[PDB]
Design a protein around this ligand. Structure first.
Ligand SMILES: Cc1ncc(COP(=O)(O)O)c(C/N=C(\CC#N)C(=O)O)c1O
Ligand SMILES: Cc1ncc(COP(=O)(O)O)c(C/N=C(\CC#N)C(=O)O)c1O
Lengths: 406, 406
C-alpha cells in the first residue's frame, strides 16, 4: 500500500486553504472520492443514464445492469448470503429508521425493551426513542467503562429476556472504540433479541463480515467510504426482511395495485419505492471496487499506524485530553485545556487543517464525558504521519497563541 | 430556443444503439443531463466535498453554502415564500410518503376522506391506501371523463366536508393531461381539505408557481428535470410543516437530545435526518440554473409543438390508438392494434428508439383504459420533429413486419 499512489487518485487533496496545503482530517464527517468514483458518475451520465427495471431499451438495460451489479458488489463486500438482504437507502440514518419503523414499531409491546449504549450517534438513538414512545415499550442504556469501552458483563446485565432489540455501533465516531459486536450478537440472541448494528464508522475502515458477526441488521453510508453522497445500505437477515412491511410505498415496490389494496414485490425491491438512487449506487459499487483493490486489511493496518502515532504525539503535548481507549479506529477526539474546541478548529483551518468541533451528533456521550464539546481529527487511507505532525505542531502553536492573549 | 445548441449540451445523445443513431423518447421515465449538471457534480467532488452545517473549516463552509444555495434556487424556481418550505428528499415518492406519514396519519379519523383520481401514478396512490388503512379513514376516487380529463363538477361531487386531503397529479405521466390544480385547490379548501400535488411530470416541463396554484404540498423529482438521481423536493405551506412531526429521526434534525426525549431543529432541517444529499442537491441547483436560462415557457412552447406534431402524425397511421386529450403535455401513450406494446418497444430499440412499454406505474389507469399495457413516447427540450418522424416511420414498419409474420 503506497500512500503517494493513493493520494494521487484524490484530486481534492491537491489544493491550498488560507495559503497552506490542505490537511483533511475530517473523514469521519465525510470521506473524499478517488477518480475511479467520480469518473464512474460521469460515465453513467455521459453514456447510459436511463430508468431501471423495465429492460426494453438498450440504455435502460445498461442502467439496470449497473444498478443491480452494484447490489451484487455490496453483497460480496459485506459477505451477505443474498442480494435479497441488500437494500439501497439514502444513508445509515434512513437505514436505521427503516428498522425502527418496520421492525421495532410492529414487534414492541409494553414490557418489551430496546437496549442501546451511551456512546451511540443520534441516528442510532432518536429512532428508538420514537419507536418505544409509539409502542409504550422501554428504552435502556448499557453503561460504559471508564476508558469508553463496553464490558460483556454489562451487556448480560442490561439485556434481559424482555429485550426485543439491541442496537449498538460497530465503531464509535467519537471514542474510536471497536465494540464486541459478535459477542453482543450472541448475548442478544441468547435472550430472544435481534441486534441492529450501526456500521457507518466501521464499514469504510475495516473488513465487514455479517456472516461472522451474525448481526440481524447492519447499516452503512456511501459518503463515508469514498462513495457518492445520498446513498446507503440496509442489510437485514432475509427471514426478518420477509416478515417486515415496507417503510415507504409507491411504484417499483408493488406487484398488484387495486383501488384500495396492493401487494408487494419480492425482496429486495419490496423496500425500494420510486425511481432509485441509480448513479449513486453505481458509484458506491465503484467505491467498493476501489477499496477491495487496495484491501480493507491494508487500509486497517494503515489506520492502526496513524492512530498509534497520533496517540503518542498527542501525549507529548501538555494540556491536551484525549477521550476513549488505547486500542482504537483511526480518529482522536480531544480538548485543549482552556481553549474552546470551536476556536481550536478555527485556528486549525487558518493553517490548512480540517477538523470537526461540537457534539459529533453524540450529545449523551458528551454528557457522560462531562464536556459540552470536543474537537476531532479523523483519518482515512489518504492520510499520513507528516499530516499528523502538522496537526500536533498546530495544536502546540494554538496553545501558545491563546497563552499570549491571556 | 435553438435545439441544435441544446442537444450539443447533452453528451449522451450523440451515440448509436444497434447501429442507428439513438432516439431517446423516454424522458417521462428519466431525463438526460447537460454538461452544466455533470460538471457541477465533478467540481463538487474534485474541489469542495465536505459535510455540511458545521462551518468550521473552509471546504465545510463551501459545501454548506452550495447545499443551502441550492435550497434558495429551488425556492425561487417554484416561487415558494420561504426556504423553510423547501425540504430536500430522495424523490417524489419519498416526498409524497412523508405527507402521508406525518400529515395524513396524524390528521385522519374514521369518517375522514382522502380523495385521489383514477389517473394517479402509484407514488400518489399506495401511501394514501396505507394511511387510510392505518387510521380507519376512507379513500375515494374522482372519476375521469372519456378523454381522460377531470371535470370540476366531478370534483365538487367527490370532495365533501368530510374530505381532509385531496391528492392529485399536476400532469399525468400517461394521458398527458394537465389537471386544473388551481381550481382543485379552491374546492379542496372550500370543504376544509388540504391539497397535495404530485408535480413529478409537471415540474421539468412547465413553470411552477405554488403561490398561484395555492397547493398545500407539492412534490417533484430531480431525475426528471435534467438533475441528478436520488434527489427530490417536498414543498409544504410553512404553517402545515410547523405542525407536522418529522418522518425520520437522527442527527442534523435535532436540537437537544436527552436519554429518552429530544427536541427538533427549525424548518426546514426538522425534516432532513442524517448527512444530506449534498452533491445531488447542488446538481439539482445547476439543473434549475440551466432550465431557467433557457426559460420554462420556451421549453413548454417547444413541447406544445412536438405534441401537436406527434398527435397529427399518429393520426396518419391506421391501427394505432392514442390515449388521453388533445390538449396535453409532451408525451403520447398508445397501442398498435394486435401488437403487444412490449414487442413495439423491442422493435423500436432495434431501430435506435427508446420508448417505455407496461403499466407506467398506473395500474388503475390501465384498467380504466380497459387495456393491460401500453407503449409511450415522452419528449423533452432535446427532442425534435425529425425524431418524431423516425418514431412514426418505425411504427409503420412495425405494423407491416407483424403483418408479414401472420
Ligand atoms: C457511527 C455513525 N452512525 C451514524 C452516522 C450517521 O450516518 P449518516 O449521516 O451518513 O446518515 C454517522 C455519521 N457520522 C458523522 C457524520 C457527520 N457529520 C460524524 O461526523 O461523525 C456515524 O459515524
Ligand atoms: C406523475 C408522477 N408521479 C410520481 C412519479 C414517481 O416519481 P419518482 O420515481 O421520481 O419517485 C413519477 C415518475 N414517473 C415515471 C418514472 C419511471 N420509470 C414514469 O415512467 O412515468 C411520475 O411521473
Amino acid at each position: 500500500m503506497n500512500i503517494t499512489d493513493i493520494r494521487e487518485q484524490f484530486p481534492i487533496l491537491h489544493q491550498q486553504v488560507n495559503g497552506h496545503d490542505l490537511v483533511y482530517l475530517d473523514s469521519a464527517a465525510t470521506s473524499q472520492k478517488p477518480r475511479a468514483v467520480i469518473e464512474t458518475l460521469d460515465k453513467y451520465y455521459n453514456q447510459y443514464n436511463s430508468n431501471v427495471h423495465r429492460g426494453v431499451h438498450t440504455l435502460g438495460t445498461r442502467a439496470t445492469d449497473g444498478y443491480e451489479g452494484a447490489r451484487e458488489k455490496v453483497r460480496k463486500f459485506i459477505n451477505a448470503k443474498s442480494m435479497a438482504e441488500i437494500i439501497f437507502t439514502k444513508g445509515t440514518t434512513t437505514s436505521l429508521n427503516m428498522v425502527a419503523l418496520s421492525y421495532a414499531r410492529a414487534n414492541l409491546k409494553p414490557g418489551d425493551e430496546v437496549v442501546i449504549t451511551y456512546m451511540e450517534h443520534h441516528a442510532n438513538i432518536i429512532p428508538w426513542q420514537q419507536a418505544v414512545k409509539a409502542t409504550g415499550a422501554t428504552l435502556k442504556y448499557i453503561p460504559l467503562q471508564e476508558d469508553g469501552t463496553i464490558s460483556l458483563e454489562d451487556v448480560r446485565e442490561t439485556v434481559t429476556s424482555n429485550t426485543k432489540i439491541v442496537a449498538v455501533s460497530h465503531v464509535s465516531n467519537v471514542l474510536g472504540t471497536v465494540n464486541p459486536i459478535k459477542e453482543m450478537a450472541k448475548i442478544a440472541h441468547d435472550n430472544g433479541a435481534v441486534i441492529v448494528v450501526d456500521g457507518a464508522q466501521s464499514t469504510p475502515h475495516m473488513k465487514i463480515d455479517v456472516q461472522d458477526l451474525d448481526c440481524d441488521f447492519f447499516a452503512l453510508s456511501s459518503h463515508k467510504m469514498c462513495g457518492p453522497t445520498g446513498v446507503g445500505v440496509l442489510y437485514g437477515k432475509k427471514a426478518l426482511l420477509e416478515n417486515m412491511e415496507p417503510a415507504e410505498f409507491g411504484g417499483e415496490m408493488i406487484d398488484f395495485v387495486g383501488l384500495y389494496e396492493s401487494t408487494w414485490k419480492e425482496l429486495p425491491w419490496k423496500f425500494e419505492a420510486g425511481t432509485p438512487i441509480i448513479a449513486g449506487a453505481i458509484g458506491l459499487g465503484a467505491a467498493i471496487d476501489f477499496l477491495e483493490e487496495i484491501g480493507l486489511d491494508e487500509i486497517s493496518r494503515h489506520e492502526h499506524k496513524l492512530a498509534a502515532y497520533a496517540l503518542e504525539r498527542f501525549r507529548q503535548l501538555d494540556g491536551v485530553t484525549v477521550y476513549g481507549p488505547e486500542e482504537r479506529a483511526g480518529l482522536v477526539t480531544f480538548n485543549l485545556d482552556d481553549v474552546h474546541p470551536h476556536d481550536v478548529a478555527t485556528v486549525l483551518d487558518a493553517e490548512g487543517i480540517a477538523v470537526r468541533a461540537g457534539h459529533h451528533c453524540a450529545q449523551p456521550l458528551m454528557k457522560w464525558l462531562d464536556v459540552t464539546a470536543t474537537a476531532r481529527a479523523s483519518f482515512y487511507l489518504y492520510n499520513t504521519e507528516e499530516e499528523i505532525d502538522k496537526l500536533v505542531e498546530a495544536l502546540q502553536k494554538t496553545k501558545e497563541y491563546f497563552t499570549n492573549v491571556f
